Amino acid sequence: ARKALIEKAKRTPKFKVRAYTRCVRCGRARSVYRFFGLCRICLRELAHKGQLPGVRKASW
């Protein structure tokens, strides 16, 4: 049960609470950042390829 779950998260819900975020890239339900709309795994995948504008590896 994932594809139906990916579609049911898009569908506006019968109540405002039932809304939750998924990963727009892989459908992952957990650890979804709202800034990117991505999960932690896709966040690191796109950032490593340079396809996140501005996002760079941070060291200090």
Partner 1 sequence: IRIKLRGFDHKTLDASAQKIVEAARRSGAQVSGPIPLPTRVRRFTVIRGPFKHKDSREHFELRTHNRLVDIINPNRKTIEQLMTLDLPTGVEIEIKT
What does the binding site for RNA look like in residue numbers (CB under 7 A)? 1-5, 8, 14-21, 23, 25-28, 31-35, 39, 41-42, 45, 57, 59-60
Kindly tell me the sign of the dihedral angle through the C-alpha atoms of 10, 32, 35, 26: negative
33 binds partner 1 per the rule CB under 8 A: yes
Residue 7 annotated as binding site = no
Closest among 13, 36, 14 to 22, alpha carbons compared: 36
Is position 26 annotated in a ligand binding site?
A: yes
Helix (H) or strand (E) holding 54: none
CB of 44 to Mg ion, least distance (A): 17
